[PDB]
Amino acid sequence: KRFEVKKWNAVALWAWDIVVDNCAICRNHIMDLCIECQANQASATSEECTVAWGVCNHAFHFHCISRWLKTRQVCPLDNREWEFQKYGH
Amino acid sequence: CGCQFTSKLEGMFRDMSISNTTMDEFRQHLQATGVSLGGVDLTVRVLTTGYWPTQSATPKCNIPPAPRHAFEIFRRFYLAKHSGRQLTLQHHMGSADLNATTRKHILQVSTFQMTILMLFNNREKYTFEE
Amino acid sequence: MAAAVRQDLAQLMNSSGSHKDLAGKYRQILEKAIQLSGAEQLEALKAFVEAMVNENVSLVISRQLLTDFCTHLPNLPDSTAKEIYHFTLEKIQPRVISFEEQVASIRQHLASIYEKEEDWRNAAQVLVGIPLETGQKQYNVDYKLETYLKIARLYLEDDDPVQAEAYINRASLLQNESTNEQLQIHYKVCYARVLDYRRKFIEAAQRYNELSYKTIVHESERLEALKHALHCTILASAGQQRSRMLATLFKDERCQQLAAYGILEKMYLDR
Ligand SMILES: [Zn+2]
Ligand SMILES: [Zn+2]
Ligand SMILES: [Zn+2]
């Protein structure tokens, strides 16, 4: 051949995916509503119960983390202050 | 300045340290197992999306066959001994050293012209449509 | 005459010419191999697969002829063309990143054919192998939803729903992106089933009851979904949530038509 490649320095990005698991506050799942949505409210009409992503890349139900923010505000998996970087999956 | 905006930057250069340290493990695998023509000379880099933003769109162009084997080997290794995370390939990053051939002068393509030159090697006399 | 076909493929690989002429000549060779039968046809098609995956052959030449090879395959009965399905699936590996549409078609065909021979075990594993996560070939949200739904349904029939939970997981991830309502209805039925299987009888009854008051679902399927809701409610944990569902199920007149109508009637009225 006329042109042959010898060296290559590509950058391979990695991202934690399949982040399905469990909203550890509600202990039901990362999705499929929460304890405050399958045991508390019955109507569940015009409702949401999304996910809640923080700066430390942790994931919980929006309902579960918001209620947890009443007393404590320190993201019980660490001591980070848990900024709200995203909602939903 | 503070934490929130600045800590993201301090993680970018930290991931640059992550890249070479991850390659230190990769280099250890290179010392143990020899690589064939698909993998003659590779220095791949591993970064985290939590600090380094996407350039424009992370495109999905094709790959030349020799880099195809090299990326396949690295992806297979990363999915075997580093399970729990899958890699995404992109073209808007990196470089290359294209050995051309009166002497043998190695060119340089920044992972943009690799696809174009590879098609030329397969067959010359192309155009914008090709 | 498989050796002659292989020799023709090898000679055509080293030939130089326009892409259209090469594609036509290869297509004629493929048609001749299809006209064969028995082991001769199997070896001829195996050589055809080997030629397509060869590096020298152009990608456009490779991608379409493999697609055309795949299209003629369902015509051949359920037999010899399946050891080549495994052969072709493993063959696509150096260029598995180049194209995944043919791999997707083969896996979908293989899963359905495995589904024919009462095999939800191997059909699941084959269809798991799909790289839906990639997104390079941006599988339309329905297709990823359809594939994830099929794996979950296959994993439901043999009942190993440790992965089916993890597959109904990624199914709902893409679910709130899709458009097709019938696919959404088919999803909610499967999701309601998944709740019924694992331990979520009370949650399955809620999902079944929500799906019971639908219009596009067949009246027989609507009655069947409600019948599952009644069965799930009876089998659910006896508590406040179950009592409310029992009260709700004591309203449908199509509950009365069911044979278990007496069962919840004694249940809710207290006995
Ligand atoms: Zn929760
Ligand atoms: Zn909630
Ligand atoms: Zn945290």
Side-chain angles (χ1 to χ4, degrees), chain A residues 33-34 36-37 41 47 49 61 63-64:
Chain A
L33 280 298
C34 66
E36 217 185 333
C37 280
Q41 21 240 19
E47 245 260 337
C49 205
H61 285 128
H63 292 187
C64 288

Side-chain angles (χ1 to χ4, degrees), chain C residues 1 26 47 79 84 89 113 119 123 163 207 231 235 253 263:
Chain C
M1 293 178 294
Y26 274 117
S79 63
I84 191 167
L89 272 182
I113 295 180
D119 199 334
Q163 294 81 18
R207 294 301 181 181
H231 289 192
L235 298 180
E253 308 294 275
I263 306 301

Side-chain angles (χ1 to χ4, degrees), chain A residues 23-29 33-35 49 60-65:
Chain A
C23 181
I25 300 168
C26 69
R27 198 184 303 283
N28 190 2
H29 189 66
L33 280 298
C34 66
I35 55 156
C49 205
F60 316 97
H61 285 128
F62 167 65
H63 292 187
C64 288
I65 182 63

